[PDB]
Structure formats: C-alpha cells, structure tokens
Symmetry: C3
Subunit: 330 residues, 3 copies
C-alpha cells in the first residue's frame, strides 16, 4: 500500500485492510477521551455501580471511545480522505470492558468515480465496511462509512468503477443477542435518583448548553486516527475536526440533558452539514423521537442537530451536524 | 430541576442536589490532571514510596484531583454561575486511594438576593455545603462555597431570601481522626533526600517560577465541571478559567519550591482577585506563615498570592488569586 | 540548591542531583503521552500481543515515554536552560513495564564557560550524565546531554571551568545483555501482517505525512519537565518546545512509515537545527541507513530529518531537527 495512503484509483471492490494495530482499552484512554469530549454516562464513570449493574469483568468502556478507536483504526485506508459523507449502522453487538483489545478490519464494499467537474480535483467515493472484534473473536461493531478520496495525479478519469453506493449499510443484521441482557436495571433504579424510563417523554425537543471544541488533534492521536486533514492544515486549507469529536460533544450534551442514560445502542450520521474547526463552540437541539418500553426500562430514539455559535449577536449560528442514535435507559 | 441549571430564584434554603454521578478515581484521571496542572507530590507520583509510607490499598489520589472532582460534581447546582466568591473549609477527613469512588451532595445553606443596581443583572448569592463521601460511606470532604447566580428573566426583585451568609463555613468540625496517622514519616525521611520538616522555616517568603494556563476546558470536562462560563464564551464574553485550575498551578509552584510536602491537609480561597483566562502565564509569592512540629514531622501553614504576567516589561503584573492551605511535611 | 535552579556558576564537576521524585509508569501516563505525540508501536498498544511476545509482568511502556520521564526528571538541574545542544547515548539496558518506577540521577560530567561575546549574556555549557534505574536497582538508561546555562548576574567571567566537552558520551558501554533477548519474534511474525524484517530495505529514503505540535506544555508537565523555557514565554521571548516532543512526533512519523517496528533500542540527536513552537506543523524525511539481520529479525539504523511547514506555497519549509535511532524489527 502506497506511502501516505491509497488514492481512490488504488482501491478495489473487496480489498481488505487488516494490518491496523490492535488497541487495548484502558482507563488511561478513557480519561483522555473524557477530558476532550466529556463523559457523564454513569456506568462509564462509577466502577462500583458498573459492577453492580453489569457484573462486568472490568469497568464500562465509554461507547464513544470504542467507536472512535474503531474508526481511527480504519483510517489506514483513508489517510487521503477529503470528506466522509456519513457513518452508518454502528450498532454494538457487545459492550467491551476496560482491558479488552479491539481489532478492526476495513473492507471496500463499493467504489464510484465522481463525475468530472471543471475546477475540481478528480475524486471517487469508497463505501467501506468496518468490522471490529475483540481477542475472543466476538463481534463488537460492524458498521459503514462513505469516504471521498482524491484520484492519483495521472489517473485517467472514467465511469467504471461505478458501483451503486446509495444503499450501503441497510438491512444490516441486528445483533444475535441483546448486548445488555445481563445488565440489572433494578439496582440502577434503586441507586440512581429518578426520573427513570418513561415512554411519555417521546416528542420532547430539548436545547443543550454549549461546549468548546478543543484538543481535536489529541483525540485523533489518542484513537490512531491518521486522516491527514485532522493534522495537516494544508490538505483542506485549515485542519478539519474529526466527525466523531463533534458527535462526542453532542452525546455529552444529550447526557447533561438526560443524566440517566445507561448506554448508546446504535448510531449513525444523517448529514455532515458543515465543517467544524478547533475553537468552535457547539450546542445541540435534541429531539426525543421515540420511547419504547421493554421488560427492563426502555430505549429512546434520539436525533441531534448540532450548531456552531457565530461570533456575534448579529450573525446566525450554523448547523454543522445531524445525527441520530438510540440509548438504553433503565 | 430546570434545563441548563437553576436560576437564583429556583433555589431554597435546605434544598439538596444529590443526583451527580459517582466518580471512580483512576490513574487515568490522575495522569490527565497532572498533564494540565502538574504534579510533583512524591506520594502521588511514586507507588512504591506511597505503599511504604501509607501501606494504602492503592496509590495516593492527588489531593487537588480529589477536590476538583468534588467541586466539578457540585456544579450541577451552579451551571448558571456568574462567579464563586470563595471556596472555604476544605479539610480532608481521609485521603482516598486510586479505585475509590467519590459521591458529592450539595446543600443550599443560605440565600441572599443582591441589592438592585442600575445596569446590573438581577442576581443573588447561594451559600453551598458540599459533602463528599466514598462507597464505604466515609467522609472525605465537607466544604463550602459562595456562588453568585442570575435570577430568572421575570423574577420580582426583593430582599427576602435575605440570609446572613458572612460566616458560612466557620467553626466547622475538625476531622474525628488524623487522616495521616497511619503514614510512616520515618521511611519517608530515610528514602527521600532532606531537608525534612523544620519549624525554623516559618516566616519565609518565596517566589515561584511561572506556569502557562492551558487545557482549562479539559480540566473542567475531566472533573465533570459544567459551569457554563468555563465552556461558553458568551456567558461572560470570554471563557473564565475554573478557580481550581489556578489553585492547582499555585500548588504545583509551591511543590517545586518545597519538594518534600507529603500532602495538602486543608485549604480555602481568600480572594478571587481577578479573572484568569486560557493562555495566561502565572507565578506566585509563597508565604510560609506557620510551621508547627508534631510527633511525626510537622504542618506548614502557607499563603499563596498568584499573579498573571502582563504582556510587556512596561506593564505591571496583576494579582489574580489569594489562597491559603496547610500541608503535612515529614 | 538555588530557588529557580542553579546558574552555570553554581555547578561543579562531579556534582549530583538525586532528589528528583520517582515516577511510576501507568497506563494513564501512557495514554496522555499518546494523545500528545501519537503511538503506533504495536507492543505498546496491544496488551495481548505484548504478553505473547514479551511475557512481560505488565504491558510495554512506550520507549519515548520512558525517555521523556528520565529527561523531565533531570530538569531539576536545568530549570534555567537556554538550549540543550544535544541528547546522546540513550540506549535501553532494559524495557520497563507499566507499574515499574523510574528514578534518575543527574551528574555534572564537565563544565566549560563560553567565551565572552558583546551583546550576549554570560553563559557556560554543562555536560550532564543521567542514570535512570528502577526500584529493583536495574539500569534502564545511562545517557548524556549538553545544556547551555546562564551565569549568575554578578559572575566574574573567566575560562576556568574549561573542561573539554567534545567527546561527552562516547565509548559508552553497551548493555550487559540484550534487553529483548526473551522477546519471541516468531509469534509476532505469525500474528502481525508482513512485511517483516528485510535487510534489503537499507538505503531507502521515505517521506512522512505531517503532524501538528500541540499540548507541548502538557507533555512537559506530564513528564516533570520544569525547564522554564517550555512554560514561561519571557525566558526566550516565546515558549520553546521541548526537544523530546519533536523527536516523539518524528518517531510517530517513522512508525506510520514502518508499522512493524518492535521498539527503539537507542537514539541521539545530531543537530537541534532550529526552534520549534506550539502550533508548528512538522514532517520528516526518514533515511534507513542500515539494516542488519540477527538470529530473530534484525535492527534498522534510522536517521530522521524533521521540517517545519512554512505558512505558504511560496516560502521554503525549514529543518528543525536531525536525529538518529535504531529500532528492532522482527
Ligand atoms: Cl477541490
Ligand atoms: Cl452584569
Ligand atoms: Cl542572549
């Protein structure tokens, strides 16, 4: 594989990138991740509660950390990325503990050359499937993204890698088993102040407080993310903040709004609406789209619109991200 | 409780905020804390010495980390804070180990509406008592602060929450037991180069080297501190640095000056003299006000004046903080 | 020893600074270090692979972290430093595990007053020997640096500390034993995708992707580095980035280029060509100078030229560092 990463025309449908380092989750990584994007997930902060609830071999790896590690691992293929158009179908098949080691395979699922346009660099889109497992060979995540890559300088433009990429990561199999089935919602309800799960909150629209985007290159280094645009301002003209950082702050915002979320069960990004830069201040509008009771608590469906604060009272704030996720709540 | 935190007129004398997440202290949190404010406390850095000295179930949680976690926990009540006028009566009742989990209760002890003043936002002061315990229900900290909060937009100003707040956190009970009684000062003296404790140093006035204020929002995220002014520049016009960060650097300064301090036993802030901002460079003048011999070493009483460096040789530096603490020294 | 550190004329040939705190290596420190300079060393990231390969009592402390801690420890003597002219003869005598504690002795090996020059501050050079051991008294590192220090304000200039410093840290004893002799290269080759060691790569010249210099004061605080120029802009006029940070990014660059390096065996800096500042963007030219087969894999000799990116397409990039190291590769 080329130094600096593949160009679009270096890739093939079915090609596999599996030489990414394994990464052992530690409370070290957890703390650094928390200092950058925040962490108010009670099971990820309190080991005694985590043990009472999950009985887990160790404390709960923050789900945003697990996702960020899997996505940063996969950037071997996409060091040359100009933009990811979406992340899709992240659903946890299990929730790793601190001390578990994650290994991520990246497969090219589909390739489509972009139509030539005057003044634009030749580029194509790569549909990528990431499969993240642990040392026990159990599936953790199996998810998709759509990466725009430049073609090599002498590439002969044409149409023919021309895969249909529209439906990438759909009808994707649900997990074999409920990843929280062994979690005891009853001790959570007893030890954590309510309100606990209530299907009556569906429909609510909440407005978060703001966070600063800072430590963005640190988050990328922490999670092995080597997409050049996060590190090197000359790729896009300014460094572009990793999508997961913006998502991470939006999740922290949602958790200040809804302090009793147990975990994130699945998520995807709907629109990366505008670029985010280091030093931006973000807030979100949180829609509770659905609330479904289960035998033990229930599951909220959330949709988060994230905005960057403009530099004055006389300039409108701008939408930068639209994403959606589901969360378990006891 | 209101989204975004209570206004001054949402509070009541005797009201309790106890739904803050528990936080398990980890060497992860310790390392992140150290990268932001520094750490030269020998018992917090060296696990072998810590074990020889304290015999402790695990290594020594840096006392500034423990305080910062307890204060960040308590910011649930004070997300809307305009200023804390002081922190008072922090005295450790025990020194938690890595792996211990901290839980903090915040009680409204007193409320006083501020007198209307033309051009100023309607506000009041809240005297707050924080009680921090571990999972074993043992008292760790029991301390006070005075927070200024805005009143809600339609509040009818008056005098009557009008509690006398002047003496908040005084005649506060000393710990039941000496929190360092089981620490072996003799192995410390044998293994660490002197000078060791000497009552003759009382009266000394020392001048520190400088530190940069950086990673301020990170320290806040790390310690669950969600006071909006640390994150959102539009609350005050610029983000204001958390008081504990400034104190943390002043403590690091004192520990470079006095490398053999065993721990901080108690502390309080005397005047938050001027705001501190990210990118400020601070130094301190350290007064050793008292030095009292005990059966095993002694206790220093310290008073620290902290200054921000101006941007030229022809502009005076400005005092930003005056605080005082006591430290055990073998 | 003087508050703020010794001046050049405070030092003596044979003087010893051994009151630096011991520092226990933790996965906390490892994570913070990784967030600042990156970490792609497979044995430092993956505990399961580390155990299979080394059998080690715990996971592998990143070698750049170990070096940075030893060098930051030693800054007690050099708080007043104006420049280190080189670091020399770092060779690992063993590779510490997480949980091991490092203790560093700094000895003045040689002193040479600099010749007076009009308009320049009076200064001298100190040749320093650092010896880093663990709690088991085993040698970890035994290395050298050349620090330029100011003389005190009333110093009487002369020639006589006038030691010959040119050959400091040469003919330095190789380790008693191969520090990786018990590492199993065969399981590494089986579990990590090739290419594995190939003497045929000697001669290659590779060009890295770029990294941002950020969190520089954090790296210094993390590793107990109290050289004032890293913290206080008024010493040099701007804060100067610690040499180890630049080296750390150059090593991260080399590891993206050569993803299967097992560890760094030794290193030294050849020229600190120009200052580096926070916010610089760096890339490197990596020369594989030598490749020598051993019974288990082989050892690469690398020379790294590091450059700072200029602020436009019409300004040349500038060399900031030239260093060289050797690495084991299975
Ligand atoms: Cl373009
Ligand atoms: Cl006002
Ligand atoms: Cl000069």
């Amino acid at each position: 594989i080329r130094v600096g990463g593949p160009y679009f025309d270096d890739l093939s449908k079915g090609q596999v990138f599996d030489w990414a380092p394994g990464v052992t989750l530690s409370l070290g990584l957890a703390a650094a991740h928390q200092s950058i994007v925040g962490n108010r997930l009670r099971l990820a902060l309190d080991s005694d509660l985590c043990a009472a609830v999950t009985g887990m071999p160790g404390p709960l790896a923050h789900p945003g950390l697990v996702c960020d590690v899997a996505i940063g691992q996969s950037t071997l293929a996409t060091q040359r990325v100009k933009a990811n158009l979406f992340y899709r179908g992240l659903r946890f098949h299990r929730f790793p503990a601190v001390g578990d080691t994650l290994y991520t395979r990246t497969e090219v699922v589909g390739l489509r050359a972009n139509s030539p346009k005057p003044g634009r660099a030749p580029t194509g889109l790569a549909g990528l499937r990431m499969t993240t497992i642990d040392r026990t060979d159990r599936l953790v995540l199996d998810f998709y993204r759509c990466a725009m890559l430049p073609a090599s300088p002498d590439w002969k433009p044409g149409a023919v890698p021309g895969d249909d990429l529209s439906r990438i990561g759909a009808d994707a199999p649900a997990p074999a088993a409920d990843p929280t089935a062994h979690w005891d919602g009853a001790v959570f309800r007893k030890r954590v102040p309510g309100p606990h799960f209530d299907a009556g909150i569906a429909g609510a629209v909440l407005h978060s407080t703001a966070d600063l985007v800072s430590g963005a290159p640190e988050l990328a280094r922490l999670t092995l993310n080597i997409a050049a645009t996060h590190h090197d301002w000359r790729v896009s003209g300014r460094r572009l903040v990793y999508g997961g950082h913006t998502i991470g702050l939006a999740l922290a915002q949602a958790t200040r709004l809804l302090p009793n979320l147990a975990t994130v069960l699945d998520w995807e990004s709907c629109d990366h609406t505008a670029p985010v830069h280091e030093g931006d201040t973000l807030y979100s509008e949180l829609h509770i789209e659905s609330a479904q009771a289960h035998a033990d608590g229930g599951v909220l469906g959330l949709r988060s619109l994230v905005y960057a604060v403009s530099d004055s009272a006389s300039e409108p704030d701008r939408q930068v991200l639209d994403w959606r996720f589901s969360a378990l709540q006891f």
